[PDB]
Every structure is written in structure tokens, then in C-alpha cells.
């Protein structure tokens, strides 16, 4: 039977003779291909800088450690329960407490639900990029610069996305991204940090290597921490290499999501987020939302379109549902957070779908629901 | 020109052909490889576990984090200025003080020179096994036994080494060891934390991999943090692959440093230490100690040396020379340290470094040393 993971690497011969180029060389880490990628990614997305890491984690912990001298005054950051764990598991290690904020229908942030949530101990908000849509930037600037907060980016699913014409990356202070196996392009695993402020991009690039500042061959200084979440050289070329075909990639799951919202236009059990873009979106998910009539049902639903062979995922459980955030923050629920948990499913979308594929598995899913009743 | 790195990674095609392997599959992380890699890393030591990381210093961090929930009353580490700065930097960032010992003629930690540092503080002692050669493990151990203190091993030099004929890595409480380009193997960037302590390797586990627990494909939980340390399977095939040959290339390592020796023996200059060796070593560095009369002009005679080609470097700079270190403890400077960093160059030592290319070196070495008149 054929198996439809939701999301998977999409490697060519190109990206595998560039491998191989690496592994002619002696240079297998800390070379020129890091700085090419890092600077390809400078030029793709408008930004005057780019750190590449080993994982978006790694970028996150670089990023939140570093954005500014951690104050226990100022310890908390606001930021959204609907992202992967590690969007607030940073925070933590970083020595902040997250505070959580509502959601829209789309599964991002609620740019309209955050100034309520600002105290004297705010330092930064942290929004995502669900699925790849941009949240309302301009709202979350201008909040941030009302109140003197930091604005962070989690764009780990939108490297390709766009607001207002332009790419997603040179909004924020500075802007993470992931090319983990299945994010719009990959590194096996990776991540970056983008920004605009020289001063951080210098304090991120010693943090992220020992703190070393070489003076010749022979000796360095260490002024500061620093741990070593280098990309190497053959991730980096797969990187670079992924990156300069990332627009066909990006338009090869927009030509899928085209096909999903044709066939389900209209239909009366879910709801597809993809006909609500405003702006380009690198498409990382294809999420639908469940009619409510089918929320205690959804276990049925998952391993139904698992027999199916449709390998669909929910992104995600509310951080705060966490043992961990229980134990620490005994949280609230939101509504919005659970209310799109429960409806959220991400469907197959990848580069390497082709159309009758998904045609098919549109067909397969509206079956799946329409079994249930 | 002609010029040589003192040491480099060194793959054939059977490494290459792994990789390509990988690059075929739609499996590029979180798979099968990265378990066979640390199942090959316990058959090769003799471990109950193993845990492969993005880098060394990631598996440091994780090791030091985990081996003991800390405690701001038991906040000391005994630990050696003559290492890498990563072996000090990740106690800085798991809260712990680092107490700096006095080493030996041989570059590792001296083990007569720690019961003194010992206190109500004290919670462990890291020790690095320098240049590839395993400290005086017995020693070690039985002081951390008798102090109630954790023996943690930076062996990032070290895999393949013995101590008493039992390959390093399952001596201490954990051992740590890299992947790194230039190391014994390479995964190009990687590391391992090995342990026989069943419990101490599952919270590491979690903590290189966001703290989840999955319940099932859809749903996990977590109950303490973690981190993205993994290493993926495209590094994990070339670790399995180049360990597959690890006695190979150490013991090619062996022969280079062996043709050193006959060259060097009696030399006017400088003292290797690879004759001294009482069991087998990696071999990572092939370390020369230089008479003291050469100190004050040691930035010319390493200059020199590079002029010829001979890429050596130095290893290492007594941690507490750092500004970090400076602006944070009041350390008296350590002479052993000092008279080892002043003496130490490193010189070109790796497994494609053929018979006659060590000849050459070996050679213009002596050429370099001779002509620095007093």
C-alpha cells in the first residue's frame, strides 16, 4: 500500500553531487560553504545577516540568550501555545516565563489579544508563523514599539512566506527558521537566525562557537559563554543547494494545497485554511479544521485515514497542556488553543506530491468523513 | 608550497557510498542509523550505553546537566586548564565553579594533586584525556569514591584508547567523546555521551530531544525540557562507517607517530611524548614539549614552521587565562599549566599522512629548532 507521510525531505541529484563535493574535501566543517548558504539565505530573504545552526532549537536558545541581558525584572515574554514545544521550552532555559496568548482561526497568534497580557515584567513577544502564514506583522510591531518590547520571530515553517509582498525574515528583530528533514528546505537537521541589528548577529555568531574570538592560528580569546551548534559543511551545501531551487519547492506544495481546495470547496466536515491567504505561504502544512460535530470522534478519523495510508498529523497539543507547564504555571486553557487542537488535522503536502496523488487522497478524506456521520 | 593541516578528516568511498546511501532515503533524521551508531559504540567499549549528539560540547552540556539535579550548596568542579575551553564553558552553563588542578609532564590531569582541592562543594571532577592518552583512571576513581564525588570523563580525544588494556569510555560515571572533522572519526560535526548508568542515559535522551515522551504517533508529552542535539542519519551512517576502520586509522595514526620517533630520539630540541605511552593511545595529537630555552621565541618557531609548510598548532591556552574566566574567579596562575602551554606544539598526526610526508615534516622540524641560535 502506498504510505503518504504529511511532510517529507524532497532531495535531487543536484543536492546529492553537492554532498558529494563535500565529502572530496578536507574541509568538513567550519568552511565556505556555511558562509555561502548563510549568505544565499542574506540575499534570498532581504536581511543584512544569517547565522546557520544545527537545529532552529539551537537558533531559538541562540537567539533568546542573546537578544538581551536577561533581567529577573523583566522575565516575561508573551507568545503563543499553538507552536512545536521547543517555541517555549527556550524560554525556559533562557530564564523566561512564557505567557500565554489567544489564537485565531488560522492557528496564529491573536495580534488583537496581546496588549492585555503586557505588564511592567514583558521584555519580548514570540509569534509563529503557523503553517507558514505570516501573522499580522505590522500590528505586532507597532504594539511592540509602544510598549518597548523586543518582537521575535518563530518562522520555522516560512522560509519562502511573504506579508505584504515581502519575505517573512526581516520583520522582527531578528527571525528563526528550521530546515529539519520536513521543512521547506532541509539540512537533515538545521536552523538559522536572520536579522538586521550587526550587534546581535556578533553576539549570535561567538555564542553559537565557544565564545572564541581567534586573534591569529595559534590563540583566541573568550570573553563570553558559547557552545558549539555549528552546520557543517555538508548540511550546509545540502542547504545551499535546497535553497536555490526553494521557490519551485514552495510552488510545487502551492500547486498541491490549489488542488486540495478545489475538491474541497464547500464541503460540509472540514475547513481548509489555505483559501484565506493573504500572502504567500511556504505551505510547510495543509491544515483543516474539523466541524466540532466530529471533536470526540477525531481518534476514529486519524486511524481511519492511517488505514487509508493518508499519514495525517495535528499540529499541535497547547504547550501549556504540558506536564511540565502544568507543574510550573498551572495554566488556564484557551478556548481558541483547544478549540483548534481538537478541529486541527495536517493533511499530505510536500514537493514531491504529484496531483493525481493528491486528487486521490482529497477524494479518500472526504470519504473518511463522510463514513463517520 | 605544500602544506599540512596537523590534522584532518579522512573518509574513503566506503564512507562516501554510506552517506549517498542516506541521501536516497526519505529518512534523513531521527532514524535507524543513529541507533546501529551507538549500538556499534557499546560493542566497540564495552558500554551498556551510548548516545550520539550534534557536537561534543552538546553531549558535555547534556552530561553535566544530568548527572545530578543541581545544588547551589555542592556548585564545585575539579576539573584541568589544560583542555579545550568547551570542557569548562558547559560547567559555567549548568551553574557549576570550575576548580582548576595542576597536570602533568604529559599534558593530563594530576591525580596526586586533587584530594587537596576537595571540599563541602565539591560534586565532581572532569578530567580530559589528553592528546588521546587515558588518565590514571584508578586513581581517579577511587578518590571520587571516597569523596562521594562523580567521576566524569571528557575523552574527546580518546576513543579508541586504553587504560590497563580496556578501551576508555567506561571508566567514569559518563564519558564524552567527538565526532568532530579532525578527531579519531568523524561524523564532520558530532559527539557521544557513553554511560553503564541505565538511568542517567534515559534523562539524557530526553534532554537532546525537546524532553518528549510519545504516547503515540499523535500525541506526547513532557515533563521536563530538552533540547535539538541529534545527530542526524546522514552523520550517523559516516560515524558507523568510519568506526567500522577506527583501529585501522588509529594504528595509522600509530606508525606516523612511531616514524617521528625514530627521528626525533635524542634530539637537542624537545621531548615527544608518545614514547612515554604505557598502553595504546588514538593518537589525536602527537604533542612535542620544547626545552624552556625556546619559550621566549616560541611565536617565531611556531611562524617558522608554518613558513615550511608544518601547520602546528598549540594545545591549549590554561583555561583561566581567558578574559571570561579572569573577570569571573581569581586563579593563580598553575606553573605546571604554564610551563606545559609555553613547551607544547602539536604537529601534523593523522591517518592519510603517509610515511614520507612524516620523513619531510620530521625532518624540517629539526631544521626549524636548529636554526634558533639561544
Known sequence: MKEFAYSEPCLDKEDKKAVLEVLNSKQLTQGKRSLLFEEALCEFLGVKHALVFNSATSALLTLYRNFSEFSADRNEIITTPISF??????????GYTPVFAGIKNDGNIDELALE???????KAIVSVDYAGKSVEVESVQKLCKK??????SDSSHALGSEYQNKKVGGFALASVFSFHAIKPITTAEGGAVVTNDSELH?????FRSHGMLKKDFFEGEVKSIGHNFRLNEIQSALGLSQLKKAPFL?????????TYDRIFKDNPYFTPLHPLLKDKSSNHLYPI??????????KLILESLHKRGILAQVHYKPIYQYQLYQQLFNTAPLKSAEDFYHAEISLPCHANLNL??????????LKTFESFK
Open 85 to 94: 514545544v521547543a517555541t517555549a521550552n527556550m524560554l525556559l532555559e533562557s
Open 116 to 122: 492585555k497580557l503586557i505588564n511592567e515584567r514583558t
Open 147 to 152: 510598549h518597548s518590547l523586543s518582537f521575535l
Open 202 to 206: 556578533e553576539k549570535m555568531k561567538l
Open 250 to 258: 514552495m510552488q510545487k506544495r502551492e500547486e498541491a494545497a490549489l
Open 289 to 298: 479544521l474539523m466541524h466540532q460535530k466530529f471533536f470526540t470522534c477525531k
Open 356 to 365: 493525481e496523488s493528491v486528487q486521490n487522497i482529497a477524494h479518500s478524506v
